[PDB]
Symmetry: C3
Subunit: 278 residues, 3 copies
């Protein structure tokens, strides 16, 4: 699989917050193309990204990012007056840095991680109304040398939903046996959850893959997550287990009973899924 | 005594689902010997376990595992038609694999860990009723040269009970000062908990033990866990602290007040527990 | 600086005292009780004898996490190691360095971010002690650990921070570049997720990566439950500059209801751009 290059590029993007169907709100890279979750932002460690942000709505909104570097003027908080007025525009700047050695001899960790952005002013001073409506999205920051996936999928547990979807509507995600699939798992809102995958597992470290044979990270298929937690991993689809409709769910019993469920549809090369009704 | 060997043996076992008193249900290795939690299944990485499984109950049941490799047909789900009908039989196969380097140069995570099995059919299409009833049990998969303990105890925080026991009935576990004790700690149901042990601590990694002086893992005595979380560790009973009645409990305050307490009884070599006057 | 090897025997005096409005707290000097309790810092190898006085009219105890204590310093009713009202008792905490056992395994040492609390007030799990403020931090350093310019303790106790009224911080200030140690402890009934704008840390013992081979997750958001304890050291304003950097629980209803504070990081000229209450 491909390998992430060393960062250092200054990139520039427009992003738009727009109302969607049913009182929903989302970000998009171009006007009329807001989505929930918002578009995935992929950065190589050392990149800078300038986000020419526009709020097309009738209420204040913001863009705030976890993990990445930002001056206070890019917080996306009302307390700092770095939110965006109705119809307004503002340029947010996120930077990243590589790991390295400080002067005090100590080690400065790098920006690599599975991170996210969201709104910080819709509803409350903490964006409670924004998460509900869907103002959240993933950011991946890659380290030089990181393995690249064949497909990246974001699953957000926002209160009692997956991706603001109604219960028992997924979403489902498709791969072929052997595909290197990347999952981005963010939790928002009020409730704790446990993310669980049938038939697959990952390491509980930065990349979800053991570094080598001296990596002591626990290997799990089940992880407790809370509001604003984010992690990610990469799995070889159906490795050791074969093709099939592999179920993923929250393992909080009433949460999986009420529809916090989806399917990881792993197809054989020819396209059919063993033991599945399409 | 000693260390885990290399794996790869094909094993077979018989397993039954039976009713127990009080509307409870359990797994056992022989009829009339079901237990809550179910029997401890131990495997070495590479072993294959065929579970000749009989449902001696009048309602459907299934057998589902975390962490191990299994195909779709051994899912143990109503979904891909692998539950066991009342009075029916099924052979579930579980497989494990050693760590290795993939063709693409990535490091494939092995099966070794503290895992668990449970039903996916009683009550709801998830394990809900089965969990409340007691249909759950531990699986340990050891890697070559993992340190082997003198005794293994399973503690399941299932909803607001420890192993479906009444409030304030533990259970209690005995060891002698110096014993190498292994704890398997599983959680199920609806609530998060925080498992805590008095006078002992473990490392937050696969084994619960620091590999050596370069393992950076947290050293902890308190750990948040949610439904279907599982971890385990080994400790030396009494090490640096001496014999006595060492409390373990969930540390959610109302949880310990309403039953979620037990005792780790560490005896002196003469068998007495100092200061423990029941 | 860096922490030295341990070995020393330490003696300290502690009091459980009542506070205004039905609160309780621990103090090192009599009449100086506080919530959170005083910071206790040890080096691996050290022993601490805490001569302890209950200045109150109901029983109290002193229980610790992570450290080594024999049963007689358990601080529980079960082991009859609580302190009578008006009474005194010496609790002994021991620590140890890591080393290799006779059986060749590696014994993990005592170093870490730990805490002490009450275990008898209200119930035999100190539910009433936690409600009133009887908890505090304990830090145990490994030899060679990097020492901060400052340490601040943040206890999520139910839906309060350090038993404070909602929306009352606390705030903590530093100057850009300073080495700031946060101790973070949760108690009560609720899970929380502790988060900091502008800063991140490693999920390991020290909070910092040991080097380029450390695979720990680097995070700015950490779920935690009652009696969870952890710590980290950040460089104030590193890569992001001065400002009023919020920290808050991220469970949405807990941030909205007051579980919010400021990490006030100033420029060397003392200014904090954009900050105004
Ligand atoms: Cu859930
Ligand atoms: Cu499963
Ligand atoms: Cu399942
Ligand atoms: Cu946030
Ligand atoms: Cu509990
Ligand atoms: Cu304790
Ligand atoms: Cu499960
Ligand atoms: Cu306790
Ligand atoms: Cu909270
Ligand atoms: Cu934030
Ligand atoms: Cu925030
Ligand atoms: Cu405690």
């Amino acid at each position: 699989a491909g390998a992430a290059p060393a960062g250092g590029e200054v990139r520039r993007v427009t992003m738009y917050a727009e109302r969607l169907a049913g009182g929903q709100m989302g970000y998009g890279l171009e006007k009329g193309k807001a989505s929930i979750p918002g578009p995935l932002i992929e950065l190589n460690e050392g990149d800078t990204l300038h986000v020419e942000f526009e709020n097309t709505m009738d209420v204040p909104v913001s863009l705030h990012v976890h993990g990445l570097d930002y001056e206070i003027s890019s917080d996306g908080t009302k307390q700092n007056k770095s939110h965006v007025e109705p119809g307004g525009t503002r340029t947010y700047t996120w930077r990243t840095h590589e790991p390295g050695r400080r002067a005090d001899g100590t080690w400065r960790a790098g920006s690599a991680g599975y991170w996210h952005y969201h709104d910080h002013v819709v509803g409350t001073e903490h964006g409670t109304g924004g998460f509900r409506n869907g103002l959240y999205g993933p950011v991946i920051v890659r380290r030089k040398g990181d393995v690249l996936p064949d497909a990246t999928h974001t699953i957000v547990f926002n209160d009692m939903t997956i991706n603001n979807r109604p219960a028992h509507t997924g979403p489902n995600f498709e791969a072929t046996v052997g595909d290197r699939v990347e999952i981005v798992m963010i939790t928002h809102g009020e409730y704790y959850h446990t993310f669980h995958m049938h038939g697959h597992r990952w390491a509980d470290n930065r990349t979800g893959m053991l570094t080598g044979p001296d990596d002591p990270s626990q290997v799990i298929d089940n992880k407790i997550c809370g509001p604003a937690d984010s992690f990610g991993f990469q799995i070889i689809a159906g490795e050791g287990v074969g093709a099939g409709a592999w179920m993923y769910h929250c393992h909080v019993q009433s949460h999986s009973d009420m529809g916090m469920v989806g399917l990881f549809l792993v197809k054989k090369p020819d396209g059919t899924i063993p033991g599945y009704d399409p």
